[PDB]
Design an enzyme around this catalytic site. Structure first.
Site, PDB file in Angstrom:
ATOM      1  NE  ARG A   1     -30.336 -35.011 -20.869  1.00  0.00           N
ATOM      2  CZ  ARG A   1     -30.926 -34.034 -20.175  1.00  0.00           C
ATOM      3  NH1 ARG A   1     -31.441 -34.249 -18.966  1.00  0.00           N
ATOM      4  NH2 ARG A   1     -31.005 -32.823 -20.704  1.00  0.00           N
TER       5      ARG A   1
ATOM      6  CG  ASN B   1     -23.511 -39.992 -26.459  1.00  0.00           C
ATOM      7  OD1 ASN B   1     -22.571 -40.173 -27.235  1.00  0.00           O
ATOM      8  ND2 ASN B   1     -23.451 -39.138 -25.457  1.00  0.00           N
TER       9      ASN B   1
ATOM     10  NE  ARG C   1     -16.250 -32.855 -21.488  1.00  0.00           N
ATOM     11  CZ  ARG C   1     -17.296 -33.584 -21.861  1.00  0.00           C
ATOM     12  NH1 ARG C   1     -17.133 -34.727 -22.527  1.00  0.00           N
ATOM     13  NH2 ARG C   1     -18.514 -33.164 -21.554  1.00  0.00           N
TER      14      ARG C   1
ATOM     15  CG  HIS D   1     -17.859 -39.421 -27.153  1.00  0.00           C
ATOM     16  ND1 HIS D   1     -17.114 -38.365 -26.678  1.00  0.00           N
ATOM     17  CD2 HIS D   1     -19.102 -39.263 -26.636  1.00  0.00           C
ATOM     18  CE1 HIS D   1     -17.865 -37.606 -25.903  1.00  0.00           C
ATOM     19  NE2 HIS D   1     -19.075 -38.135 -25.854  1.00  0.00           N
TER      20      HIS D   1
ATOM     21  CB  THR E   1     -22.620 -32.148 -20.632  1.00  0.00           C
ATOM     22  OG1 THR E   1     -22.689 -32.848 -21.879  1.00  0.00           O
ATOM     23  CG2 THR E   1     -22.343 -33.141 -19.535  1.00  0.00           C
TER      24      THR E   1
HETATM   25  N1  LIG Z   1     -20.122 -35.323 -26.930  1.00  0.00           N
HETATM   26  C1  LIG Z   1     -21.330 -35.886 -27.434  1.00  0.00           C
HETATM   27  O1  LIG Z   1     -21.388 -36.569 -28.453  1.00  0.00           O
HETATM   28  C2  LIG Z   1     -22.569 -35.584 -26.563  1.00  0.00           C
HETATM   29  C3  LIG Z   1     -23.863 -36.221 -26.968  1.00  0.00           C
HETATM   30  N2  LIG Z   1     -25.063 -36.113 -26.104  1.00  0.00           N
HETATM   31  C4  LIG Z   1     -26.183 -36.710 -26.506  1.00  0.00           C
HETATM   32  O2  LIG Z   1     -27.151 -35.679 -27.045  1.00  0.00           O
HETATM   33  C5  LIG Z   1     -28.297 -36.238 -27.018  1.00  0.00           C
HETATM   34  C6  LIG Z   1     -29.349 -35.284 -26.460  1.00  0.00           C
HETATM   35  O3  LIG Z   1     -28.944 -34.913 -25.148  1.00  0.00           O
HETATM   36  P1  LIG Z   1     -29.904 -33.808 -24.418  1.00  0.00           P
HETATM   37  O4  LIG Z   1     -30.015 -32.629 -25.217  1.00  0.00           O
HETATM   38  O5  LIG Z   1     -29.282 -33.387 -23.109  1.00  0.00           O
HETATM   39  O6  LIG Z   1     -31.364 -34.557 -24.178  1.00  0.00           O
HETATM   40  P2  LIG Z   1     -32.753 -33.746 -24.051  1.00  0.00           P
HETATM   41  O7  LIG Z   1     -33.624 -34.708 -23.255  1.00  0.00           O
HETATM   42  O8  LIG Z   1     -32.495 -32.386 -23.438  1.00  0.00           O
HETATM   43  O9  LIG Z   1     -33.311 -33.517 -25.593  1.00  0.00           O
HETATM   44  C7  LIG Z   1     -33.585 -34.642 -26.467  1.00  0.00           C
HETATM   45  C8  LIG Z   1     -34.453 -34.132 -27.494  1.00  0.00           C
HETATM   46  O10 LIG Z   1     -34.666 -35.133 -28.625  1.00  0.00           O
HETATM   47  C9  LIG Z   1     -35.897 -34.944 -28.921  1.00  0.00           C
HETATM   48  N3  LIG Z   1     -36.465 -36.102 -29.619  1.00  0.00           N
HETATM   49  C10 LIG Z   1     -36.781 -37.303 -29.123  1.00  0.00           C
HETATM   50  N4  LIG Z   1     -37.266 -38.054 -30.118  1.00  0.00           N
HETATM   51  C11 LIG Z   1     -37.290 -37.309 -31.226  1.00  0.00           C
HETATM   52  C12 LIG Z   1     -37.686 -37.524 -32.550  1.00  0.00           C
HETATM   53  N5  LIG Z   1     -38.225 -38.795 -32.928  1.00  0.00           N
HETATM   54  N6  LIG Z   1     -37.563 -36.530 -33.449  1.00  0.00           N
HETATM   55  C13 LIG Z   1     -37.065 -35.356 -33.113  1.00  0.00           C
HETATM   56  N7  LIG Z   1     -36.685 -35.107 -31.875  1.00  0.00           N
HETATM   57  C14 LIG Z   1     -36.785 -36.063 -30.907  1.00  0.00           C
HETATM   58  C15 LIG Z   1     -36.653 -34.714 -27.465  1.00  0.00           C
HETATM   59  O11 LIG Z   1     -38.042 -34.263 -27.693  1.00  0.00           O
HETATM   60  C16 LIG Z   1     -35.897 -33.867 -26.895  1.00  0.00           C
HETATM   61  O12 LIG Z   1     -36.346 -32.414 -27.149  1.00  0.00           O
HETATM   62  C17 LIG Z   1     -28.163 -37.560 -26.015  1.00  0.00           C
HETATM   63  O13 LIG Z   1     -28.072 -38.745 -26.839  1.00  0.00           O
HETATM   64  C18 LIG Z   1     -27.092 -37.278 -25.377  1.00  0.00           C
HETATM   65  O14 LIG Z   1     -26.413 -38.477 -24.759  1.00  0.00           O
HETATM   66  C19 LIG Z   1     -24.884 -35.370 -24.798  1.00  0.00           C
HETATM   67  C20 LIG Z   1     -23.750 -34.347 -24.727  1.00  0.00           C
HETATM   68  C21 LIG Z   1     -22.521 -34.567 -25.513  1.00  0.00           C
END
Ligand SMILES: NC(=O)C1=CN([C@@H]2O[C@H](COP(=O)(O)OP(=O)(O)OC[C@H]3O[C@@H](n4cnc5c(N)ncnc54)[C@H](O)[C@@H]3O)[C@@H](O)[C@H]2O)CC=C1
Ligand SMILES: NC(=O)C1=CN([C@@H]2O[C@H](COP(=O)(O)OP(=O)(O)OC[C@H]3O[C@@H](n4cnc5c(N)ncnc54)[C@H](O)[C@@H]3O)[C@@H](O)[C@H]2O)CC=C1
Ligand SMILES: NC(=O)C1=CN([C@@H]2O[C@H](COP(=O)(O)OP(=O)(O)OC[C@H]3O[C@@H](n4cnc5c(N)ncnc54)[C@H](O)[C@@H]3O)[C@@H](O)[C@H]2O)CC=C1
Ligand SMILES: NC(=O)C1=CN([C@@H]2O[C@H](COP(=O)(O)OP(=O)(O)OC[C@H]3O[C@@H](n4cnc5c(N)ncnc54)[C@H](O)[C@@H]3O)[C@@H](O)[C@H]2O)CC=C1
Lengths: 329, 320, 326, 328
Positions: B97, B126, B157, B181, B236
């Site tokens: 993230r 991402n 959006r 994106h 988000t």
């Molecule tokens: N429009 C898009 O494409 C968007 C993509 N997004 C991306 O979504 C991803 C997650 O964002 P959030 O949910 O807010 O982050 P978060 O910190 O809320 O959740 C991330 C999750 O991944 C899990 N995780 C980490 N390593 C592993 C693994 N090896 N195996 C399984 N699970 C794991 C972690 O435990 C955590 O529960 C990020 O890369 C964001 O940048 C954010 C929102 C929009």
């Protein structure tokens, strides 16, 4: 001139009168779970969010607005001033302190009573005809508080209550029996909390009394220990809090269930928190959950459940627990 | 036993889920995807996977406690990907993230592919275009089965912002954000319309610096939106959850709707490298079956080639 | 008494999202079932002159209450059952025989509207009036004149369905869902409808841009035959099953949804177009309209080719020729 | 090139949730529209012998595709259009009374099922089969015998609508929604069905405990007439509008939802009941059945009075008596 005027001929000057407006007070975990569930169930034509911190509030609003393409709720608004909540049919209250690991809901009372003294007068100023649906904990006592502060008749002041406990119980029952929770009928009444009351005498699938088939149901002599299923219901929120820090998705879905019966005037029966004086043996102004007919006027009717003397005794103890906190306020 | 006093079993059943979905990563994005998929009845089985085992069990239990209100009869979780077996669709939301999320994907993707060799892979983590490529390389899947959420959200959006300015619902405002994106995305001013009325033909300054109404600022607002919401609430979740569920609906119901999503675009749009970018894609039960060929301006086309070259520059630096 | 032994009453009913359907025929009941399954109303009221069939349709719907979320369904020949409707849908009257023009129904259905509409206004003077009965454009004009409603609140279902048909046929030819195929049919809901070839697009890609002869007589792919199929669709279905019901049912429920939820979606629907598109008479026909809780608040100004514009003023001319006689 | 190829680059050269309706009459088309509006299918197939009517109905539904989420609707008198269906709903046949027992009349719809069912099996051998045509308990048995399917995959609509009507009537008398009234009509569809007074309840409160005369002639509220009213309601609606369609279509879409989403809800539907409830013959009677992706997997064992039990046993004997005389 402007693109909008090049493209669109305006035929109608409109002042906005909202017809099916819902307000959520508090954009914490519970409030936003309520919001998304209400949005995805198409219950409001306008959703208003209110809270005390303006950045969090605007952030949550914009995040929902960005999904408008995927929703059928055209107006999502927010503000720190309660003018944005004006003329709501239903105002859902989720603001307040929540439990730490191991903490009782009842330990939240001093903090959240004081919060309701700020919130409720503001709600009632701008939506004097709304139904109030209280979610903040301890939910039974805070529905009472919202009632005393608002001055509303008791049909319009509702606590989410044991709708969620009963959903949790039915899910666990269905897992053991191998059917969907929809087909497992069982009622958790009383406090939404440690003193809730399982109504073993009423549990059934397809009208088949489970206690008739399995007479030890609900006793400590039961070889299957079905009483531990109610214990899991009591413990469920503390278990989820220990694991993820809070609970949100189940209560949001439960609140949206209640909201559907209100907004669509379904007159479905739900176990929700209401002023129970003069029924079930209770002599004080306590709010606790009993089966209530829920529609566009709120609680129109209470179902008179035929409890065993022991179920009745547990319910009286639940009331006495709540009244013991209520009398100090 | 009460169960046997109450119920006479007539059939020995093997659990074979027919419309299973898995979400990998139960953070803010994954759980928004989960609740949206559940409230749209898109799966008969939902599986959740994460490395944080307490968080994972709590989230699963919280969803399960709402079963009475849903029509998805089975919700399961685990750190072992056996729980994901035989998914139709596997959504990846795990990660920080780029190199941090590559290293994660090096463990995730082979596990997904072992247990659901026939699934569609929908990548959200991402940078989504680069990690869809990574997922494609690691999985070995054919490109039709590897999809990045891409510009689906950017376009939603955009349509919301256009609607608020024009006084109509996003549904009635049509406009396409393509390419990468985020920062380098491409607003296709030439396709923007309400009721088939070309806004750029009506308003020739649309998309230019000389526009007294500054519609180019609506694209900047799309570009900036995730950063503004992150600044305000920290992350988000709700808009992306709904847009992922919209994609899931087109896949699960074989709708063959057109979405701006990230696909392996080599050989089209003048692109000569193995990169993923968003273009309008026909999406159904086999994933991306067809790509719409948009008529881009010469430097809309140049801008999209710049994204390809930008993404390719990063991909060359990947270790996995 | 069991009810009083079971239920303690606490509280001594004004519906908030009521819809009425007038005419419980093939179209009316298709509209009813579609609205019911979309949870758009908290009360549905049905009116007809055939009292037996009216009571039977009501009872058949009521028997399905367990499966619905609209808790009250009522009916009667007396319009008091319709009081306080937000939306009233007119589906009553004569329908086409095989090969019959919709315009040929006008005299019979004007007569019917003369009793219906004043009774609707009586009980729901603030409703939105959605006219479906044919010929829908002329009967929307009639409903407007009889009701005294402002024009925003008298809507004809118009070309919402024609455009839906058009988009289904386009999607079948292009291999994509109707939702992703965009194309507008304007003017009369009937033989003189106008396909706006310049707006037909997928993903904002104008088909006429790739294929400028699209829709013209010089088109080797014969896309003009797609519009002909739209024009002919009602006739083909009447020849096959005797009437049409399901598609208009769904189209009316689409419109209901934009009205009841204040969506402000754009729909090709029949409205009082005087002083737009170069038209100088009190004609109703379909243009793209912004549809919400106050009905039609805004009209999109579509830029037509000279031929599309000519075809629309001919559609306009064809109507009015009938209106002026009434 | 063609417009489509100028617009779309094809990158890539079997429906997963398909449903067929056989018989596009009043019942069949109500089933179809209800199933379409609930988004249960990725493909809907329609079959009838009336080819014009069939094409007309198909086209009418297709014209509404924009407003639905079922992307393919198909039709034909040839059953190839039905291939790979998860669920096949049989609504074809002459209109007949719920309990119809007269052999000549029964045999007419048996003959129709002799032509339909083998063609259904030909093209969807793994489907679940849902029988709506009357007489429903006998015709579900016939469908089972002709199809060769295992009993879990042949389902009669049975008393599913009867119980919904009963809950509607209960709610009208009690001032609550049908959803919050619970009650079960079991056994043989029609005059001989069995209203299980013991299980009728709101919020787990047994009406029979509050009102012990419930279900007897002496009951001054005449609740026993609510059952008569259920049994007669279809006939009353026919008398009024000529047939029934909307309620049965909704109730069938509810069953289909349980099947398609593997919900394992309990429904009062007609199942091959030999070996249970003291029944020794190959008959179909309605009991509370757990309904999921494999059809009927489990049955609830309702505690019945000696007289309720006897009623079910006699229904079995008289159904078996009729069935012995059928030709197919
Ligand atoms: N429009 C898009 O494409 C968007 C993509 N997004 C991306 O979504 C991803 C997650 O964002 P959030 O949910 O807010 O982050 P978060 O910190 O809320 O959740 C991330 C999750 O991944 C899990 N995780 C980490 N390593 C592993 C693994 N090896 N195996 C399984 N699970 C794991 C972690 O435990 C955590 O529960 C990020 O890369 C964001 O940048 C954010 C929102 C929009
Ligand atoms: N079944 C039920 O009734 C349940 C109710 N819950 C209660 O819901 C309430 C909110 O829980 P969460 O949303 O998770 O908590 P949260 O920490 O995520 O949000 C707290 C919310 O209260 C709002 N608030 C407004 N004024 C104040 C104030 N003066 N002080 C603190 N907060 C204020 C706050 O800004 C925020 O919106 C708690 O009381 C919980 O105990 C939790 C879950 C279920
Ligand atoms: N796209 C559109 O605008 C559509 C318009 N359609 C029109 O819908 C109308 C009805 O079509 P169908 O339903 O198939 O016809 P129908 O014969 O099935 O039903 C007409 C109903 O109107 C009722 N009716 C007649 N007079 C009155 C009255 N004075 N008051 C109340 N009710 C009355 C009549 O009793 C009957 O139940 C016709 O004018 C059709 O041409 C048909 C399909 C599409
Ligand atoms: N509660 C219930 O279980 C209900 C069951 N019902 C029964 O459902 C059946 C159909 O009723 P309706 O739809 O009103 O009658 P209908 O006359 O409107 O439609 C019957 C359809 O079956 C078709 N058909 C006849 N033979 C064949 C065949 N060999 N192959 C394919 N199609 C064929 C016929 O052409 C016609 O389109 C009757 O048996 C009714 O008695 C009626 C309504 C409710």
């Amino acid at each position: 001139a402007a693109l909008k005027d090049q493209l669109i001929h305006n035929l109608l000057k409109e002042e906005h009168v909202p017809q099916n407006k819902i307000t959520v007070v508090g954009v914490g975990a519970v409030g936003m779970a309520c919001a998304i569930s209400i949005l995805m169930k198409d219950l409001a034509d306008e959703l208003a969010l209110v809270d005390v911190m303006e950045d969090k509030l605007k952030g949550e609003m914009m995040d929902l607005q960005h999904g408008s393409l995927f929703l059928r709720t055209p107006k999502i608004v927010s503000g720190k001033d309660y003018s944005v909540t004006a003329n709501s049919k239903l105002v859902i209250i989720t603001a307040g302190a929540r439990q730490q690991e191991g903490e009782s809901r009842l330990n939240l009372v001093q903090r959240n009573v004081n919060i309701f003294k700020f919130i409720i007068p503001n709600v009632v100023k701008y939506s004097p005809h709304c139904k109030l649906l209280v979610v903040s904990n301890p939910v039974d006592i805070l529905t009472y508080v919202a009632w005393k502060i608002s001055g509303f008749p008791k049909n319009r002041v509702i606590g989410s209550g044991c709708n969620l406990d009963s959903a949790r119980f039915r899910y666990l029952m269905g897992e053991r029996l191998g059917v969907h929770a929809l087909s497992c009928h069982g009622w958790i009444l009383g406090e939404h909390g440690d003193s809730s009351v399982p109504v073993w005498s009423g549990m059934n699938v397809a009208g088949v009394s489970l206690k008739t088939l399995h007479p030890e149901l609900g006793t400590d002599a039961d070889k299957e220990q079905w009483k531990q299923v109610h214990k899991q219901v009591v413990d469920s929120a503390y278990e989820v809090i220990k694991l993820k820090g809070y609970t949100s998705w189940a209560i949001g879905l439960s609140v949206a269930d209640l909201a559907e019966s209100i907004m669509k005037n379904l007159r479905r029966v739900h176990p929700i928190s209401t002023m129970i004086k003069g029924l079930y043996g209770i002599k004080e102004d306590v709010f606790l959950s009993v089966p209530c007919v829920l529609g566009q006027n709120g609680i129109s009717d209470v179902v008179k459940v035929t409890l065993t003397s022991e179920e009745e005794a547990h319910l009286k103890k639940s009331a006495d627990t709540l009244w013991g906190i209520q009398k100090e306020l």
